Design a protein around this ligand. Structure first.
Ligand SMILES: *[C@@H]1O[C@H](CO)[C@@H](O[C@@H]2O[C@H](CO)[C@@H](O[C@@H]3O[C@H](CO[C@H]4O[C@H](CO)[C@@H](O)[C@H](O)[C@@H]4O)[C@@H](O)[C@H](O[C@H]4O[C@H](CO)[C@@H](O)[C@H](O)[C@@H]4O)[C@@H]3O)[C@H](O)[C@H]2NC(C)=O)[C@H](O)[C@H]1NC(C)=O
Ligand SMILES: *[C@@H]1O[C@H](CO)[C@@H](O[C@@H]2O[C@H](CO)[C@@H](O[C@@H]3O[C@H](CO[C@H]4O[C@H](CO)[C@@H](O)[C@H](O)[C@@H]4O)[C@@H](O)[C@H](O[C@H]4O[C@H](CO)[C@@H](O)[C@H](O)[C@@H]4O)[C@@H]3O)[C@H](O)[C@H]2NC(C)=O)[C@H](O)[C@H]1NC(C)=O
Ligand SMILES: CCCCCCCCCCCCCCCC(=O)OC[C@H](COP(=O)(O)OCCN)OC(=O)CCCCCCCCCCCCCCC
Ligand SMILES: CCCCCCCCCCCCCCCC(=O)OC[C@H](COP(=O)(O)OCCN)OC(=O)CCCCCCCCCCCCCCC
Ligand SMILES: CCCCCCCCCCCCCCCC(=O)OC[C@H](COP(=O)(O)O)OC(=O)CCCCCCCCCCCCCCC
Ligand SMILES: CCCCCCCCCCCCCCCC(=O)OC[C@H](COP(=O)(O)O)OC(=O)CCCCCCCCCCCCCCC
Ligand SMILES: CC1=C(/C=C/C(C)=C/C=C/C(C)=C/C=O)C(C)(C)CCC1
Ligand SMILES: CC1=C(/C=C/C(C)=C/C=C/C(C)=C/C=O)C(C)(C)CCC1
Ligand SMILES: CCCCCCCCO[C@@H]1O[C@H](CO)[C@@H](O)[C@H](O)[C@H]1O
Ligand SMILES: CCCCCCCCO[C@@H]1O[C@H](CO)[C@@H](O)[C@H](O)[C@H]1O
Ligand SMILES: *C(=O)CCCCCCCCCCCCCCC
Ligand SMILES: *C(=O)CCCCCCCCCCCCCCC
Ligand SMILES: *C(=O)CCCCCCCCCCCCCCC
Ligand SMILES: *C(=O)CCCCCCCCCCCCCCC
Lengths: 11, 326, 326, 11
């Protein structure tokens, strides 16, 4: 998930 | 019977003393002391000073940083453009008129401010919705073999503009109306007057159902699914300290994002509803002034949450502000 | 002949029309439109909204973080206490009186505001001086075998209070005086009226020489020595990338710190001097309003520079603001 | 210098 999270500016 | 009526307006004060005047024509210094009008202006000044740098900078920084110009960020830029409509469409007009003590621009000015101001805060609202949808699609991977690209980003943005017109446009053409609200210095939608010639009642519902409940449900659903997908991915790999932080930061943020959405629209909903259901009661201008205080300050606290707290954006800002360095 | 005089005041407007009134007694709506008084209040509001969180938080955060309570930080706390005197002594009083259009608290209120307001901005000024001295002592190691400890920190702070009283106290007791300035809503020191019964002229000099030139020279000297000591230590070890950054950040900061000191006191000096040397000329309230705009906004931009840009402080703040985490 | 700089909040 971490890569989709980063893209979202969420993490 | 509590107000004074007129062709395109409703002053929340009794003319039994014969002092009430058109908000388009003369100061309303009987609704509120002149110092309270000054304080209104003090506040608008605050929101312009804070809201314009923060929102504009966002746009500017995106121009200086190639890594910011990705599809997942279109809606965040949309959000900043919307806030700017709020700042110039809404706040500056109200700064000016408050310093007269009445709405000096007449009914046209009223429609105009009303439209842009309303238009700005709806694009924002729907931006926030669209965002949760995108974030849920990309992360929760609800559709299989689907990858979010630039053409979905664009529709997302445009869907946001269409939904706004779907409530900014009606009052200009017969379904509800714009009129000075509260202290008569800013023009909003009429939702507190039962004005059958325009059907205020039905609009108030439609706005409540479509532009309040729907958004609320969608946001809660998407971010529910997401705090779920992430709490699960983290249970299924506790050997990663990083994956553990990620799930805790994402939860903290979703809470913040939801609570701030309520703080912004809940008052407006709470009042709209309670007015609708206590139709035989008198509501003061300052009673109408409250939900507008909360909803308008979102032109500052929204960029703080969705931009200043977005790691990518924050860094580019610090760079740009510190003269190219650091 | 440009003003109207009275026992404890000087209105910068001509009574030839017979409209001029005591700033202690009636609105001055002939010096400036009422909307300009509202705008004055808008601004004070801004400085209270920005200046009080930022300055108070500084104090608060120091209470929550053990690592902040070191001698080299006493003067920075002093700086924040001083800004708070500016905010409450100065800004809130002026918010209130501006909303009347005159100085409603009378001559006592005038002395009071004047004293605290003046007292606050001098502790700040001298804090900034003391700081450069400490920073020069500790880093440039000018005295051999000397280590800066808690008892030097305290003297440093106290020297700051003494220097302030050395100019806040005189006008209360005969050497110069406090009177409403500009639009008559805030009481400053009289430096623009030649009022022989109190010796305004000599005080204006003494303030210029002692409370302006001295501070300027010291600051320039200490930070000169320091950007020197650090540029040299870095030349003599270019094999350290870290030592190279350190010297470049310290230079950038010193420039920022010096330029901001000028932006704050230079106007006041520039005007004081030019008034002194063009004694046969008429100066408008808004002409007197300018140097006070610059000097007062330092209750916001000073904490930003000396606190929000201090690595130690910044982190503790982010921690405290984000609910204990991050 | 780096240790005196840090103490000063300068670097
Ligand atoms: C809230 O309450 C007030 C009071 O009821 C309303 O204000 C009144 O509005 C009417 C018109 O709609 C004004 O009437 C006009 O008066 C003018 C001169 O009258 C003088 O004497 C009056 C006493 O009656 C004084 O108080 C006043 O200051 C004046 O000096 C004339 O210009 C007009 O005469 C014309 O119209 C009348 C018809 O009404 C005809 O008979 C004449 O032939 C001529 O055509 C007119 O009479 C009235 O002066 C206002 N009174 C006050 C106190 O201001 C507000 O309209 C109402 N507010 C809202 C929101 O609607
Ligand atoms: C800037 O300029 C104005 C005008 O020069 C000054 O205001 C005047 O101040 C004087 C007193 O210092 C006032 O004098 C008093 O008038 C009162 C009643 O007079 C009426 O008629 C006048 C015309 O002269 C009207 O304009 C006015 O509205 C009044 O209705 C009385 O209360 C006083 O009488 C007493 O004093 C006089 C001595 O002056 C004696 O002769 C009487 O026996 C009695 O003791 C007095 O005369 C005057 O009214 C003011 N004029 C205006 C226009 O307001 C301001 O003082 C000056 N501003 C500053 C900063 O100093
Ligand atoms: C006496 C002063 C002399 C010097 C003036 C210098 C002015 C320089 C600047 C240009 C002024 C133009 C004024 C034109 C209108 C006028 O003045 O119109 C006279 C009428 C008043 O009439 P009223 O009171 O009967 O009715 C009105 C109801 N009581 O204005 C007004 O209500 C309108 C005032 C509009 C103010 C807009 C302010 C925008 C501020 C932006 C931010 C400024 C920030 C400063 C921050 C520190
Ligand atoms: C009509 C309104 C009815 C409802 C009022 C509700 C008020 C609720 C709050 C308490 C009000 C007490 C007023 C007492 C004084 C008075 O009112 O004194 C009447 C006199 C006016 O007289 P004047 O015009 O002749 O002279 C004066 C010259 N023209 O005030 C004044 O000039 C003083 C006004 C002082 C205002 C202080 C404001 C402090 C604001 C803090 C921040 C608020 C922020 C909001 C941010 C969104
Ligand atoms: C959604 C429901 C979540 C369930 C829990 C709710 C209570 C929170 C909790 O569990 O606990 C909240 C904890 C509190 O920290 P501690 O309990 O560890 O001290 O951490 C948080 O994340 C709190 C953040 C939420 C509140 C701040 C954000 C509000 C939005 C900002 C807008 C401000 C603008 C106002 C201007 C007018
Ligand atoms: C001291 C003399 C130093 C000599 C050079 C001066 C010019 C600067 C330079 O060399 O060059 C300055 C460079 C500019 O960057 P580039 O030239 O690389 O783009 O970097 C800086 O450090 C500029 C910072 C100084 C100005 C900003 C800080 C001002 C203080 C903030 C207060 C604001 C409050 C105002 C509210 C009313
Ligand atoms: C969101 C919403 C409502 C109305 C909100 C309004 C009317 C906001 C208007 C803002 C404007 C027009 C600002 C202009 O400056 C209702 C219908 C009360 C029901 C609850 C949901
Ligand atoms: C620093 C300085 C001067 C005066 C500054 C003053 C008078 C500041 C007053 C501020 C106050 C009193 C604020 C109150 O709210 C002089 C003598 C002009 C000479 C130049 C140096
Ligand atoms: C769309 C609405 C989403 C609401 C999400 C609420 C998430 C609450 O998540 C919280 O996470 C903590 C660990 O970080 C747990 O200790 C708490 O018990 C739990 O309530
Ligand atoms: C007390 C006053 C101190 C003034 C210090 C001015 C320092 C100017 O330092 C600058 O450092 C740069 C590298 O970082 C050089 O490239 C510039 O040429 C030089 O002027
Ligand atoms: C790099 O050097 C960045 C330089 C510029 C920093 C500017 C900071 C402005 C801050 C205003 C803060 C207001 C806080 C208000 C809290 C209520
Ligand atoms: C390039 O490196 C410049 C860096 C420093 C910028 C510092 C800016 C501080 C601004 C503080 C707020 C000033 C305005 C306050 C208005 C009320
Ligand atoms: C951790 O989550 C920190 C949370 C709180 C951040 C609060 C930020 C307030 C910012 C006000 C900024 C004003 C900028 C004005 C520029 C002119
Ligand atoms: C604990 O983690 C809480 C964290 C988030 C705090 C977010 C605060 C945003 C504040 C924005 C500015 C709001 C006030 C604007 C006044 C004009």
């Amino acid at each position: 998930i971490l890569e989709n999270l980063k893209d979202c500016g969420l993490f | 019977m509590c107000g004074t009526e007129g062709p395109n307006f409703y002053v929340p004060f009794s003319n039994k003393t014969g002092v009430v005047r058109s908000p388009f024509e003369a100061p309303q210094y009987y609704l509120a002391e002149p110092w309270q009008f000054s304080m209104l202006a003090a506040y608008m000044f605050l929101l312009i000073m804070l809201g314009f740098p923060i929102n504009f900078l966002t746009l500017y920084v995106t121009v200086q940083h190639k890594k910011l110009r990705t599809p997942l960020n279109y809606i965040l830029l949309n959000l900043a453009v919307a806030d700017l409509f709020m700042v110039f469409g809404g706040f500056t007009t109200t700064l000016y008129t408050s310093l007269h003590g009445y709405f000096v621009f007449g009914p046209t000015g009223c429609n105009l401010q009303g439209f842009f101001a309303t238009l700005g805060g709806e694009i924002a609202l729907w931006s926030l919705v669209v965002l949760a949808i995108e974030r849920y699609v990309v992360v929760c991977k609800p559709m299989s073999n689907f990858r979010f690209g630039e053409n979905h980003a664009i529709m997302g943005v445009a869907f946001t503009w269409v939904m706004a017109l779907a409530c900014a446009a009606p009052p200009l053409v017969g379904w509800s109306r714009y009129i000075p609200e509260g202290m008569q210095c800013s023009c909003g939608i009429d939702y507190y007057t039962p004005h059958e010639e325009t059907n205020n009642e039905s609009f108030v519902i439609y706005m409540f159902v479509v532009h309040f409940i729907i958004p609320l449900i969608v946001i809660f659903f998407c971010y529910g699914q997401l705090v779920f997908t992430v709490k699960e991915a983290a249970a299924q790999q506790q050997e990663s300290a990083t994956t553990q932080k990620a799930e805790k930061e994402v939860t903290r943020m979703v809470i913040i994002m939801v609570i701030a959405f309520l703080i912004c629209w809940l008052p407006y909903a709470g009042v709209a509803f309670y007015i609708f259901t206590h139709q035989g009661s008198c509501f003061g201008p300052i009673f109408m002034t409250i939900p507008a205080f909360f909803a308008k300050t979102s032109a500052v606290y929204n960029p703080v949450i969705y931009i200043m707290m977005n790691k990518q954006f924050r860094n580019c800002m610090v760079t740009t502000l510190c003269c190219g360095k650091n």
